[PDB]
Amino acid sequence: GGRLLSVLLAVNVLLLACTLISGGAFNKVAVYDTDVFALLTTMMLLAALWIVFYLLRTARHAGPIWLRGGLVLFGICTLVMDVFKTGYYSSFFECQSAIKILHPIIQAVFVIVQTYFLWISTHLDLTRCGLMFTLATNLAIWMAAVVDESVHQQQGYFYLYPFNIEYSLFASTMLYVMWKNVGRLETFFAGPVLGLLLFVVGLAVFILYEVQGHTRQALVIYYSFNIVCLGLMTLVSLSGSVIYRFDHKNPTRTLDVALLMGAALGQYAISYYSIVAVVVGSPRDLQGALNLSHALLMIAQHTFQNVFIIESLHRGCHWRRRCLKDISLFLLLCNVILWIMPAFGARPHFSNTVEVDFYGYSLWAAIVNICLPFGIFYRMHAVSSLLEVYVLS
Amino acid sequence: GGRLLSVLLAVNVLLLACTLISGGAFNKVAVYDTDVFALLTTMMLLAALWIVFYLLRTARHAGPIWLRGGLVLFGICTLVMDVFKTGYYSSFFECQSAIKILHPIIQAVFVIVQTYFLWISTHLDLTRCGLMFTLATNLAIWMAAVVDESVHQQQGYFYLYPFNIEYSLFASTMLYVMWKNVGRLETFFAGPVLGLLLFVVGLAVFILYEVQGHTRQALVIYYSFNIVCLGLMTLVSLSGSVIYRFDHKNPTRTLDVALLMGAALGQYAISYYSIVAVVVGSPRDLQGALNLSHALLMIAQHTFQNVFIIESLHRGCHWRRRCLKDISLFLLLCNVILWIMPAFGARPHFSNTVEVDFYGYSLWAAIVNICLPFGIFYRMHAVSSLLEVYVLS
């Protein structure tokens, strides 16, 4: 009853959808997508109709602030992909099912209505069930999108990545936040300069080799920047912690702590999978050494940055405050540049040749499509938390 | 800090173990088990050493009652399998690694110490971390055991099923319960007769065809009993609910409700996977019709029994109480007989020929090994809840 009644509906609805998505994709007789698209369209239709009904009856603690920006950005990218899908599937209809053209139209409506509904965020019991059903709708969409990339391998621009995984993650987090609240009662000129330099070098590395085989030098450049970037934050964040050593009536920021370590778990899994794939696999060559160092540095960077940020938030000589400004700002700028790759780069990175060979394309694509989008969550929260730290001290 | 510090350790430890288990088993270069066994032995060793240290320092709200009985029963079955493993791997050592014989010895010690530790259940912070680490230890063991069955296909009795999946489920549930409590501040002679008759018929069906190809008649007998058994409870439980219609200052039994629907999710997934495998797959033959009816009846039986039990618990003519006694007792006896198959029958049921062909042996074995052990949880709680209902009214 009440809150638990809505939760039980969601898991039962999610379990039903997940079985149909997984069963229809991982069976041996044939691969079914029209049924899966028919399923997703039905869930989106009901979810949109509850939201539309909710908006009309309402038009008469909020969680992270970066959540709304990510939802709109990834919602727009989904809309562009949904607009391109209707344009392509409308040129020919004689050789394609109706569900394949009706699905993008419904998805575009669902994204538009849900994004507006979440942006501006009685039967509190109906509201909870409707929110829980929509949360399961996005998680059902998230699983189908993840499965789609795994099973793989006029405009005609099919290269457009459907940002369904990222949009569903942002929507599901925002839907849960709303549901929980239903019925609630100077500068040393060393860090900023270095941080800006890595931002430009990192931005160039994304455009040249990450937007879309490649060359040996291109692979070394990507690893060289990442190793330098991750290594510098690990040293800088470690420096930040030892400064706190040479120096309480507030409560623990459980949400901030949980988000930092929780969202870092995605990159931990990527690193853990990478390490085994190099220890066994790559024949101790240059790429393996670079892969091993990059994977270890991600673990180290995430660990030490999280320690520095968590201690900095809870506490709340002139150089001490001055040095902490560049340390926070250098970590902020480096976190921003490392956010673009998990956000707009091809999930199976061209640098993951060793990983793809070890696990297979389908398994590795599943791993990155599940784990990398959580890196997005981590980078925004790291930037937002570092912004508060820099503003604070 | 505090409770969250222990939780964060567990997920980080569990994620590390899960990646090594999944990475070492689902890669293409080679399958690694000695490393996985070496990993599990290390986790069990530390978990056992914390428990041993905990017992010495302590020897100077409890959740379901059936939990302890399931832990001891499945712990004993694991010990018999661990005893048989040492006996087999000690006859020859010239052609097998040392980790393969050291693992059962450590596992037997871990099971013995953990079962005793959980049966009798300061540094509250150390205690929480130790409990969380052991909880992740059992979940790491649970995942490795599930993966072992999927990748498949003197005494010499290797047929002995390692009840690692079931024991780990019971241990992890008991470990979480303890962790949460750390630092806490007549008869109509119609149902019993019918229930007993189905118990004998069901018990015979388990011995004849379920302990261990088979015959067509054997398959029909298994479906005939299950369809009759599941159909009867659906009618009986529905009868029980309509009786409540022809007739509040207590709180909702959230744990009892969550356990009923939560544990029923495993059979829901089995049924959902079964239905698709018959709708597409089996060529509308006798087995498909029996499979379809059995899968649907499991969904119906679980749904209506849960509704009847949940309403019965919350509320707390002479025939009205008399009829409810046989209805509760008939459901109790039928729940007991349907508990033995998910508990001691071969996970890939001989009746799942259609399912195995549709999904493949590896995928279906993974599905049943994940979902069926939760049916155990459901059956015990259904029996325990029905026992309270029969005692109450």
Author numbering:
A (entry chain B), B (entry chain A): 27 to 86, 97 to 157, 164 to 195, 238 to 269, 288 to 314, 320 to 354, 361 to 429, 487 to 563
Paper's wording?
The otopetrin (OTOP) proteins were recently characterized as extracellular proton-activated proton channels. Several recent OTOP channel structures demonstrated that the channels form a dimer with each subunit adopting a double-barrel architecture. In this study, we performed structural and functional characterization of the Caenorhabditis elegans OTOP8 (CeOTOP8) and mouse OTOP2 (mOTOP2) and illuminated a set of conformational changes related to the proton-conducting process in OTOP. Combining the structural information from both channels, we propose a working model describing the multi-step conformational changes during the proton conducting process.
Mouse OTOP2 was expressed in HEK293F cells and purified in glyco-diosgenin (GDN) detergent. Its single-particle cryo-EM structures were determined using protein samples prepared at various pH conditions (5.0, 7.0, 8.0, and 9.0). The mOTOP2 structures at pH 8.0 and 9.0 are virtually identical. Among all, the mOTOP2 structures determined at pH 5.0 and 8.0 are better resolved and will be used to represent the low and high pH structures, respectively, in the following discussion. The structure difference in mOTOP2 between low and high pH conditions is quite subtle and mainly occurs at the N-terminal half of TM6 preceding the highly conserved glutamate (Glu250 in mOTOP2) important for proton transfer. At higher pH, however, the N-terminal half of the TM6 helix unwinds to an extended loop (right insets). This helix-to-loop structural transition occurs before the conserved Pro246 and vacates the space above Glu250 initially occupied by Pro246, allowing the Glu250 side chain to flip upwards and become completely exposed to the external solution. The outward-facing Glu250 is also stabilized by forming an H-bond with Tyr245 and a salt bridge with Arg517 in the high pH mOTOP2 structure. In state 1, a loop configuration at the N-terminal part of TM6 allows the glutamate to be exposed to the extracellular solution for protonation. The two conformations observed in mOTOP2 structures represent these first two states of the proton-conducting process, whereas the CeOTOP8 structures likely capture the next two states (states 3 and 4).
